Amino acid sequence: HMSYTWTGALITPCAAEESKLPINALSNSLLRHHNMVYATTSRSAGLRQKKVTFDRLQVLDDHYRDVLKEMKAKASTVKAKLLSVEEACKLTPPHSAKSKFGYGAKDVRNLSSKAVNHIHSVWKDLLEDTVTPIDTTIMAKNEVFCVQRKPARLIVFPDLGVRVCEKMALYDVVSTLPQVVMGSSYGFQYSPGQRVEFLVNTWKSKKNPMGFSYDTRCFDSTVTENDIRVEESIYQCCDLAPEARQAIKSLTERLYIGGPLTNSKGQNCGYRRCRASGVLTTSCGNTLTCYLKASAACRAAKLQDCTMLVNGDDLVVICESAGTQEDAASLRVFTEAMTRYSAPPGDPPQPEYDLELITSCSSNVSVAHDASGKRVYYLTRDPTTPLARAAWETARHTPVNSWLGNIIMYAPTLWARMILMTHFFSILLAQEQLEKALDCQIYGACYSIEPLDLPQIIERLHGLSAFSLHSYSPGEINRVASCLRKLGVPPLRVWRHRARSVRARLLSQGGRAATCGKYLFNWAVKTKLKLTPIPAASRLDLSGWFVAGYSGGDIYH
Numbered sequence: 260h261m262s263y264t265w266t267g268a269l270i271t272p273c274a275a276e277e278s279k280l281p282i283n284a285l286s287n288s289l290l291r292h293h294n295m296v297y298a299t300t301s302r303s304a305g306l307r308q309k310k311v312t313f314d315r316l317q318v319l320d321d322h323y324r325d326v327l328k329e330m331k332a333k334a335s336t337v338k339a340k341l342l343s344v345e346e347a348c349k350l351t352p353p354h355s356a357k358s359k360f361g362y363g364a365k366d367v368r369n370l371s372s373k374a375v376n377h378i379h380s381v382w383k384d385l386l387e388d389t390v391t392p393i394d395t396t397i398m399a400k401n402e403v404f405c406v407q408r409k410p411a412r413l414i415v416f417p418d419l420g421v422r423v424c425e426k427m428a429l430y431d432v433v434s435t436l437p438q439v440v441m442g443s444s445y446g447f448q449y450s451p452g453q454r455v456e457f458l459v460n461t462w463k464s465k466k467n468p469m470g471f472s473y474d475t476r477c478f479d480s481t482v483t484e485n486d487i488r489v490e491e492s493i494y495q496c497c498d499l500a501p502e503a504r505q506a507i508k509s510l511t512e513r514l515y516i517g518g519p520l521t522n523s524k525g526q527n528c529g530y531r532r533c534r535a536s537g538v539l540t541t542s543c544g545n546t547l548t549c550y551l552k553a554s555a556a557c558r559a560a561k562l563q564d565c566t567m568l569v570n571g572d573d574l575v576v577i578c579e580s581a582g583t584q585e586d587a588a589s590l591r592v593f594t595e596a597m598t599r600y601s602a603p604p605g606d607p608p609q610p611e612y613d614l615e616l617i618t619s620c621s622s623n624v625s626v627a628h629d630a631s632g633k634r635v636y637y638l639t640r641d642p643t644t645p646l647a648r649a650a651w652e653t654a655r656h657t658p659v660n661s662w663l664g665n666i667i668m669y670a671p672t673l674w675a676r677m678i679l680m681t682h683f684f685s686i687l688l689a690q691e692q693l694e695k696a697l698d699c700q701i702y703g704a705c706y707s708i709e710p711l712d713l714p715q716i717i718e719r720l721h722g723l724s725a726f727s728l729h730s731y732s733p734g735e736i737n738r739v740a741s742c743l744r745k746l747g748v749p750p751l752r753v754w755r756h757r758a759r760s761v762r763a764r765l766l767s768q769g770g771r772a773a774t775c776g777k778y779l780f781n782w783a784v785k786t787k788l789k790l791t792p793i794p795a796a797s798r799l800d801l802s803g804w805f806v807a808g809y810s811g812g813d814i815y816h
């Protein structure tokens with residue numbers, strides 16, 4: 260029951276890999292300790308190969324079979340539709356990996372003959388053959404981090420032709436089914452602001468609240484053939500077209516169960532017997548499996564009045580505390596049950612009695628004050644990775660602007676407002692790129708966003724409180740300050756000074772740019788302007804946002 264078996268061939272790159280931080284004229288205004296910032300390359304893939312290769316022991320009890328019975332019952336109410344080639348072709352990101360059949364993502368999007376004719380022949384083969392393993396490509400990811408070096412994470416994905424067919428058969432399923440099965444526990448249905456409301460309300464709902472979070476050591480590699488087979492039966496509970504049932508069955512047996520791994524040089528690297536990281540069902544199947552395992556473990560641990568919040572492998576549990584001594588024991592049992600379900604932890608969970616202490620999605624809840632001085636809870640995180648990645652994005656244009664994603668999702672935070680908003684609006688002003696659409700990742704999906712619509716966007720997911728946040732917790736300010744010292748980032752006083760200029764340059768331009776300067780940079784000036792609800796904020800067509808997660812799913816909205 261090994262996750263992977265390797266022939267010997269190496270995980271080869273598709274190009275020359277840049278590991279050191281590229282420097283330009285704008286770099287030093289943000290970061291000075293360039294050596295601390297790096298990117299991962301195929302040279303450290305062998306380390307991760309060793310880390311992701313292990314044997315899986317799974318023991319399934321009555322708690323497991325009970326939860327699944329309930330899950331299949333809720334799943335039976337779902338009616339899902341098949342997607343047309345055209346619909347699936349428009350969901351493909353513009354820079355998605357090109358086919359080994361002589362066409363790219365842009366040919367797929369333009370609905371070219373070579374692309375559409377190939378998509379049709381792959382679909383026909385999926386309905387006619389349900390046994391032959393589908394070929395996947397194994398690659399080492401190029402991600403930017405700060406030191407204290409991590410080995411490169413792997414990405415396993417099928418051909419562009421298979422990916423369009425996956426969307427056709429399972430896009431509606433992976434988008435609709437998770438909320439029906441899990442209700443209010445599906446985290447991807449929440450905006451950052453709505454997620455806080457849920458956590459705070461849930462914490463307040465308990466007499467003596469206890470909370471903890473769970474992180475699985477290599478979740479994708481812990482996923483067994485049984486787990487993937489169990490996910491298929493959940494999808495098969497839906498009311499589906501006959502063509503969609505055969506395509507799901509086929510994709511399961513040929514792609515999702517496992518298959519061979521191929522490098523950039525066309526060599527067989529080995530065989531995969533766990534979850535593929537770069538398929539449409541990556542996020543859905545991980546959330547369902549984690550939820551099934553954790554719900555049954557919650558029962559095994561005899562945890563009182565549980566409230567789960569799942570998104571991929573990330574899980575948060577808020578319940579009624581039975582005393583510190585019993586609470587430590589309950590969590591030991593939870594861990595032991597999860598381990599038997601083929602999901603051991605990275606670090607053992609610990610009971611927490613303060614919401615600000617729970618860490619999930621590399622984040623935590625913190626307290627700040629709004630304009631009136633009323634306490635307001637918001638979601639934050641350590642700025643080290645966002646800043647290291649913003650530093651890379653200062654010197655090089657990338658397909659996913661992390662800074663933009665971070666400004667959208669962490670808008671109320673001290674670091675995103677003072678550093679990110681200031682630095683990039685200063686660049687967009689200078690380069691006259693204020694009206695240019697930029698791509699960013701939100702819950703694993705790719706979105707083209709206009710930087711001028713940022714104030715309206717921030718109001719819908721955080722409310723007017725985000726533009727008025729002050730008097731941050733001592734611990735948060737200390738975390739930002741230590742991080743700036745570590746990376747050689749100018750202190751927050753220099754950022755205040757720059758923000759007044761950015762604000763002034765923005766206000767001068769009028770229209771949407773003045774609204775940007777007015778709302779986003781009100782914190783910089785002493786003579787504050789009245790920030791009222793933006794009429795434009797309500798008009799925003801945010802349909803498609805916070806519906807589901809698509810990490811590794813190759814989705815574009």
Ligand SMILES: COc1ccc(-c2ccc[nH]c2=O)cc1C(C)(C)C
Pocket residue numbers: 446447450451454570619620622638664665668669700701702703
């Ligand atoms: C499941 O929760 C998340 C997943 C991703 C991001 C995220 C953070 C930054 C950029 N893009 C993203 O999608 C943020 C969150 C919360 C916890 C802050 C809501």
Ligand SMILES: [Mg+2]
Pocket residue numbers: 474475476477478572
């Ligand atoms: Mg994990």
